[PDB]
Amino acid sequence: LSTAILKQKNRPNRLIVDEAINEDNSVVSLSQPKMDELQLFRGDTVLLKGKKRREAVCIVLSDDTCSDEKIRMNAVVRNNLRVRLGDVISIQPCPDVKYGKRIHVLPIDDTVEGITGNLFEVYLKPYFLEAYRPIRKGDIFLVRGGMRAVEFKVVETDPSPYCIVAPDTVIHCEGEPIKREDEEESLNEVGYDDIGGCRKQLAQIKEMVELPLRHPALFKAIGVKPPRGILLYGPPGTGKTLIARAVANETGAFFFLINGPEIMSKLAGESESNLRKAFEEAEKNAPAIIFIDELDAIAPKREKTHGEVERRIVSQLLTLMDGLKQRAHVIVMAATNRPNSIDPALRRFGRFDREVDIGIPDATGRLEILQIHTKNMKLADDVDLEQVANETHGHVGADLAALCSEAALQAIRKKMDLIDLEDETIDAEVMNSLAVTMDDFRWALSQSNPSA
Amino acid sequence: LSTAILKQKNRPNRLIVDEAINEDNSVVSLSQPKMDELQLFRGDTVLLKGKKRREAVCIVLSDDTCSDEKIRMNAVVRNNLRVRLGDVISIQPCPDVKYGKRIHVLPIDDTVEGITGNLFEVYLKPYFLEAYRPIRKGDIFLVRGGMRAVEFKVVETDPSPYCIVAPDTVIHCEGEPIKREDEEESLNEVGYDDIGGCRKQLAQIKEMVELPLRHPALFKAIGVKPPRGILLYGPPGTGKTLIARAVANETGAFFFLINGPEIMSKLAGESESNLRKAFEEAEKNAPAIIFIDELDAIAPKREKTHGEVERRIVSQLLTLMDGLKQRAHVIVMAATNRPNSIDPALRRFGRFDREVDIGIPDATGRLEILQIHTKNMKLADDVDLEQVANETHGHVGADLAALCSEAALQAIRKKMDLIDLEDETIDAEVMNSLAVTMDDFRWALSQSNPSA
Ligand SMILES: Nc1ncnc2c1ncn2[C@@H]1O[C@H](COP(=O)(O)OP(=O)(O)OP(O)(O)=S)[C@@H](O)[C@H]1O
Ligand SMILES: Nc1ncnc2c1ncn2[C@@H]1O[C@H](COP(=O)(O)OP(=O)(O)OP(O)(O)=S)[C@@H](O)[C@H]1O
Ligand SMILES: [Mg+2]
């Protein structure tokens, strides 16, 4: 009804990700009646659109064993689009791909320990030779060479984001091995999927922020001015900063984060100037989102605030909010856990004049949040998260996160006989058997707390 | 059960310290069936790990009169390892010891009064001649030379912490005699044995701080993010700073202490910079503990704080807490006696989101604390500390330390007839008979207070 902006919407090119029979990194497979519909001939370089901004460029081939409404892609392409099997992706015709002449690729440290020999010769040259491979900037791809397989990251390309690797292409691979931890931090960058029990609020945020920015034509056509200040409020640990992260990673808009304490940490004036810079920055990068995290830190009630610099900063902000003209295309988002401690002048018409209530999650919310928190956790057969969702009435996302963290620690406590703090590293067998049981959760639960 | 992180854990190399029959400083003795098990041949240089970070490097030889599960070492090695007879120590193979070419050794002032002659010639040369002695930095060893025996400290070594003293080694011994008081402060540096009635809290600290730092694999494997801010709270004098000292001395982690008042004592901005420096330092020294003692001094509720600089420092801290990325491996500990006067933003998820309650000790707690406080005291046959533990309901460890101090002063008051303030030094006999009687404690008890 109102959640309508979030609905999947069936389209010719919106296809379910299936496991590949053609195991090559550069190839995706569609059924023959699907290729005909989109007017995609055999061998055409296509543009795939995943989750969290992510893209990949592939060659399309026919497949008999593949379904009409499905697309076949291997683990690498799925990883690059940040999608698990049975996720929807957009396939797009991509006939504008120029042949690259300079690509910079770098291996991943943990997949490269012992004997360098030559990385280009043993790995990259047999991978690319006469293959006319499409690759995107930021693609993590795997190459096999004798003893074992090495993962590589595409760091730079010759045309802007993507190119075909012709025999012309100089394949630079000199430099520092990419730290595994950087790409773990990149894989586990927050998306809309990482935020649970906020469906109707995520709808509001797309309505108030994403829709006026990426489709301002609607608002101008309907003769209505888009709201320009969206305040997210709610109790401590409900997901405001997470939604902030998610928005930052999921929007097409340019995103500028301002942390409340971050601003107030800095010297008198040097903080007024940083705000100024943030608003001029957003203006400069046409369609933008300014996120002011912890608004209450920078904008408290001009009455209940003793310092002149502090009183000046609230004035500096109001001026900037009013200073953005209609044709700026900048939406200011803010988060707080004490909305009633913000200067009401900021919450007036034209400033933060729309409120999104990130409240306490319902039983279904808690289940979502538990599902998101345990996605990378080894859980036992007996763990019932619907049970955990029901026994956690007072719990916000942060509480449940801690709950899972404690339940994990209890599982570690159970394994403390075969572990010692004095050992250099932990025994191999002991590490694999680590599973968080339901009995662990029941111990976490017994120790649990709300904050509210 | 939860105390499991603290259990001793039987290993091949974990051995009980027995008195040496081989009286030489460089030598430890094991039974023949124990040397076989650990694959340690005769004469091999080994690494011994005692209490409170302390290590010694020694030669291993067989002994018939020594038990299988025991290790024979003289007073000097035991001192260096900070162990009484019948403590557990790690013995470790150590074949990577290069011959040192420059060692700096200094005598201890009270063991060196009268006739220098030549310290190296009379003492150190016969001690090292063709001996191929393993020594570590910070070893205090004793040497005999005609008239008497002199103690020496190893101040500096040629390879990093330890080396073999070959006939190549220049043994420098020029410099100031090491003050006995320095090494008394070093012997009596606080460890986990010096802290009592906090068994379950100490378990918590090892879980939350030591375990994620020295074994981050567990948390990554189990799919759980380690907590990064641990707040110790409780009433005045309960052991927080003591635990801070014990942790500093007992961890494998690099440790950085920030005292609340120490920070607030410094000029405006020059304090923000010292906070900045501390966090950067901890980050720089890979696995680290930052301890902010008296947190309430630096982070009070941003409302109930009048000064702009003070408000700025709270913002500076929060920023740093949030500034440490996942892959930093820095846990921040803090202590307070007024937890409810700390800005709540600091106590939220991701910040100091874990609390350890160092509370009032029970009867068994008080007993532990009295046993720790009297370990260096001369006590009478009639002194019953269980009786004292039971008579002290309101007492925290600080009250008990004061209680022990007063009972000692009373024992001194009893000995005032044979002592006078006007004398140059106190009579020899008088000093030895000094024993703190139970009657002294009953006086101390009669005068005692809680912080009521
Ligand atoms: N609705 C949610 N869905 C999924 N995870 C959540 C949610 N709410 C909280 N979490 C988890 O809890 C953590 C803390 O949530 P934050 O977004 O930092 O809290 P917050 O709403 O910003 O609270 P304040 O106002 O800063 S105290 C996140 O890193 C998530 O792991
Ligand atoms: N649990 C304990 N075990 C052994 N000694 C203790 C204990 N608690 C206190 N003491 C003694 O009392 C002294 C003071 O304790 P501190 O750790 O300095 O107090 P604290 O808990 O830091 O209290 P605040 O909040 O600073 S007043 C220590 O130096 C110890 O000698
Ligand atoms: Mg203290």
PDB file of C-alpha atoms in Angstrom, chain A residues 324-443:
ATOM      1  CA  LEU A 324      20.080  25.336  -0.345  1.00  0.00           C
ATOM      2  CA  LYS A 325      17.872  26.613  -3.183  1.00  0.00           C
ATOM      3  CA  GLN A 326      15.081  24.440  -4.828  1.00  0.00           C
ATOM      4  CA  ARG A 327      17.370  23.526  -7.783  1.00  0.00           C
ATOM      5  CA  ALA A 328      20.172  22.215  -5.499  1.00  0.00           C
ATOM      6  CA  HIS A 329      18.850  18.551  -5.425  1.00  0.00           C
ATOM      7  CA  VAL A 330      20.237  17.967  -1.934  1.00  0.00           C
ATOM      8  CA  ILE A 331      18.339  16.089   0.771  1.00  0.00           C
ATOM      9  CA  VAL A 332      19.602  16.402   4.287  1.00  0.00           C
ATOM     10  CA  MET A 333      19.163  13.338   6.454  1.00  0.00           C
ATOM     11  CA  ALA A 334      19.728  13.333  10.199  1.00  0.00           C
ATOM     12  CA  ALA A 335      19.633  10.788  13.058  1.00  0.00           C
ATOM     13  CA  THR A 336      19.079  11.237  16.795  1.00  0.00           C
ATOM     14  CA  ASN A 337      17.964   9.310  19.875  1.00  0.00           C
ATOM     15  CA  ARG A 338      16.806  12.481  21.607  1.00  0.00           C
ATOM     16  CA  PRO A 339      14.698  14.313  18.977  1.00  0.00           C
ATOM     17  CA  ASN A 340      13.172  16.485  21.663  1.00  0.00           C
ATOM     18  CA  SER A 341      16.583  17.924  22.579  1.00  0.00           C
ATOM     19  CA  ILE A 342      17.008  19.469  19.103  1.00  0.00           C
ATOM     20  CA  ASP A 343      16.342  23.159  18.507  1.00  0.00           C
ATOM     21  CA  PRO A 344      12.747  23.305  17.219  1.00  0.00           C
ATOM     22  CA  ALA A 345      13.710  25.907  14.566  1.00  0.00           C
ATOM     23  CA  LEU A 346      15.508  23.040  12.725  1.00  0.00           C
ATOM     24  CA  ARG A 347      12.353  20.946  12.808  1.00  0.00           C
ATOM     25  CA  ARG A 348      10.291  23.642  11.145  1.00  0.00           C
ATOM     26  CA  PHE A 349       8.938  23.660   7.579  1.00  0.00           C
ATOM     27  CA  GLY A 350      11.703  23.421   4.987  1.00  0.00           C
ATOM     28  CA  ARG A 351      14.323  22.244   7.437  1.00  0.00           C
ATOM     29  CA  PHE A 352      13.970  18.740   8.951  1.00  0.00           C
ATOM     30  CA  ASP A 353      10.285  18.800   8.187  1.00  0.00           C
ATOM     31  CA  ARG A 354       9.841  15.025   7.809  1.00  0.00           C
ATOM     32  CA  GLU A 355      10.352  12.461  10.521  1.00  0.00           C
ATOM     33  CA  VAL A 356      11.130   8.807  10.160  1.00  0.00           C
ATOM     34  CA  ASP A 357      10.396   6.771  13.286  1.00  0.00           C
ATOM     35  CA  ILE A 358      12.977   3.953  13.605  1.00  0.00           C
ATOM     36  CA  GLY A 359      11.187   2.460  16.647  1.00  0.00           C
ATOM     37  CA  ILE A 360      11.358  -0.715  18.730  1.00  0.00           C
ATOM     38  CA  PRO A 361      11.093  -3.740  16.307  1.00  0.00           C
ATOM     39  CA  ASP A 362       8.045  -6.165  16.588  1.00  0.00           C
ATOM     40  CA  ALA A 363       8.461  -9.975  16.897  1.00  0.00           C
ATOM     41  CA  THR A 364       8.909 -10.196  13.052  1.00  0.00           C
ATOM     42  CA  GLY A 365      11.508  -7.410  13.185  1.00  0.00           C
ATOM     43  CA  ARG A 366      13.550  -9.295  15.819  1.00  0.00           C
ATOM     44  CA  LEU A 367      13.437 -12.469  13.711  1.00  0.00           C
ATOM     45  CA  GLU A 368      14.745 -10.493  10.658  1.00  0.00           C
ATOM     46  CA  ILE A 369      17.493  -8.877  12.730  1.00  0.00           C
ATOM     47  CA  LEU A 370      18.526 -12.322  14.156  1.00  0.00           C
ATOM     48  CA  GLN A 371      18.603 -13.724  10.674  1.00  0.00           C
ATOM     49  CA  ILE A 372      20.845 -10.867   9.549  1.00  0.00           C
ATOM     50  CA  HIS A 373      23.153 -11.251  12.580  1.00  0.00           C
ATOM     51  CA  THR A 374      23.652 -14.968  12.338  1.00  0.00           C
ATOM     52  CA  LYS A 375      24.168 -15.146   8.548  1.00  0.00           C
ATOM     53  CA  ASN A 376      27.922 -15.575   9.080  1.00  0.00           C
ATOM     54  CA  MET A 377      27.547 -17.525  12.336  1.00  0.00           C
ATOM     55  CA  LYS A 378      27.905 -21.263  12.729  1.00  0.00           C
ATOM     56  CA  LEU A 379      24.590 -22.229  14.254  1.00  0.00           C
ATOM     57  CA  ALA A 380      23.541 -25.671  15.434  1.00  0.00           C
ATOM     58  CA  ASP A 381      20.612 -27.782  14.034  1.00  0.00           C
ATOM     59  CA  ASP A 382      18.611 -27.005  17.265  1.00  0.00           C
ATOM     60  CA  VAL A 383      18.808 -23.168  17.144  1.00  0.00           C
ATOM     61  CA  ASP A 384      15.296 -21.750  16.654  1.00  0.00           C
ATOM     62  CA  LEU A 385      15.531 -18.011  15.964  1.00  0.00           C
ATOM     63  CA  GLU A 386      11.727 -17.626  15.933  1.00  0.00           C
ATOM     64  CA  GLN A 387      11.919 -18.776  19.557  1.00  0.00           C
ATOM     65  CA  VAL A 388      14.703 -16.227  20.262  1.00  0.00           C
ATOM     66  CA  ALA A 389      12.632 -13.471  18.507  1.00  0.00           C
ATOM     67  CA  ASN A 390       9.706 -14.204  20.809  1.00  0.00           C
ATOM     68  CA  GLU A 391      11.670 -14.288  24.079  1.00  0.00           C
ATOM     69  CA  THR A 392      13.231 -10.879  23.385  1.00  0.00           C
ATOM     70  CA  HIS A 393      10.329  -8.405  23.931  1.00  0.00           C
ATOM     71  CA  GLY A 394      12.307  -5.320  24.938  1.00  0.00           C
ATOM     72  CA  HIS A 395      15.025  -5.744  22.346  1.00  0.00           C
ATOM     73  CA  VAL A 396      16.251  -3.382  19.682  1.00  0.00           C
ATOM     74  CA  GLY A 397      18.771  -4.412  16.951  1.00  0.00           C
ATOM     75  CA  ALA A 398      21.845  -3.448  19.020  1.00  0.00           C
ATOM     76  CA  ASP A 399      20.560  -5.611  21.940  1.00  0.00           C
ATOM     77  CA  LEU A 400      20.050  -8.597  19.684  1.00  0.00           C
ATOM     78  CA  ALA A 401      23.474  -8.070  18.163  1.00  0.00           C
ATOM     79  CA  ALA A 402      24.968  -8.200  21.640  1.00  0.00           C
ATOM     80  CA  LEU A 403      22.749 -11.214  22.365  1.00  0.00           C
ATOM     81  CA  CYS A 404      24.260 -13.130  19.431  1.00  0.00           C
ATOM     82  CA  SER A 405      27.702 -11.947  20.429  1.00  0.00           C
ATOM     83  CA  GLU A 406      27.223 -13.331  23.984  1.00  0.00           C
ATOM     84  CA  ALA A 407      25.684 -16.583  22.744  1.00  0.00           C
ATOM     85  CA  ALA A 408      28.848 -16.994  20.616  1.00  0.00           C
ATOM     86  CA  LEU A 409      31.004 -16.333  23.648  1.00  0.00           C
ATOM     87  CA  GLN A 410      29.154 -19.007  25.572  1.00  0.00           C
ATOM     88  CA  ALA A 411      29.921 -21.519  22.817  1.00  0.00           C
ATOM     89  CA  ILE A 412      33.581 -20.476  23.188  1.00  0.00           C
ATOM     90  CA  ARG A 413      33.212 -20.959  26.978  1.00  0.00           C
ATOM     91  CA  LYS A 414      31.975 -24.534  26.357  1.00  0.00           C
ATOM     92  CA  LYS A 415      35.091 -25.195  24.214  1.00  0.00           C
ATOM     93  CA  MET A 416      37.535 -23.690  26.856  1.00  0.00           C
ATOM     94  CA  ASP A 417      38.878 -27.154  27.840  1.00  0.00           C
ATOM     95  CA  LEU A 418      40.510 -27.660  24.461  1.00  0.00           C
ATOM     96  CA  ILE A 419      41.492 -23.900  24.301  1.00  0.00           C
ATOM     97  CA  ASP A 420      44.077 -22.042  26.352  1.00  0.00           C
ATOM     98  CA  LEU A 421      44.972 -18.370  26.445  1.00  0.00           C
ATOM     99  CA  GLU A 422      48.681 -19.273  26.742  1.00  0.00           C
ATOM    100  CA  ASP A 423      48.816 -21.159  23.371  1.00  0.00           C
ATOM    101  CA  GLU A 424      50.189 -19.403  20.285  1.00  0.00           C
ATOM    102  CA  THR A 425      47.184 -20.407  18.115  1.00  0.00           C
ATOM    103  CA  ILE A 426      43.988 -22.470  18.507  1.00  0.00           C
ATOM    104  CA  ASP A 427      43.828 -26.183  17.550  1.00  0.00           C
ATOM    105  CA  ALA A 428      42.476 -26.823  14.009  1.00  0.00           C
ATOM    106  CA  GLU A 429      39.750 -29.390  14.921  1.00  0.00           C
ATOM    107  CA  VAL A 430      38.464 -27.192  17.816  1.00  0.00           C
ATOM    108  CA  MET A 431      37.819 -24.271  15.421  1.00  0.00           C
ATOM    109  CA  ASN A 432      35.547 -26.286  13.045  1.00  0.00           C
ATOM    110  CA  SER A 433      33.319 -27.913  15.678  1.00  0.00           C
ATOM    111  CA  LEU A 434      32.463 -24.354  16.986  1.00  0.00           C
ATOM    112  CA  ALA A 435      28.765 -24.097  16.659  1.00  0.00           C
ATOM    113  CA  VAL A 436      26.457 -21.829  18.624  1.00  0.00           C
ATOM    114  CA  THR A 437      23.757 -24.026  20.163  1.00  0.00           C
ATOM    115  CA  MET A 438      20.250 -22.976  21.255  1.00  0.00           C
ATOM    116  CA  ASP A 439      21.437 -23.611  24.849  1.00  0.00           C
ATOM    117  CA  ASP A 440      23.972 -20.847  24.221  1.00  0.00           C
ATOM    118  CA  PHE A 441      21.143 -18.464  23.247  1.00  0.00           C
ATOM    119  CA  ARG A 442      19.161 -19.433  26.322  1.00  0.00           C
ATOM    120  CA  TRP A 443      22.232 -18.432  28.382  1.00  0.00           C
TER     121      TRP A 443
END
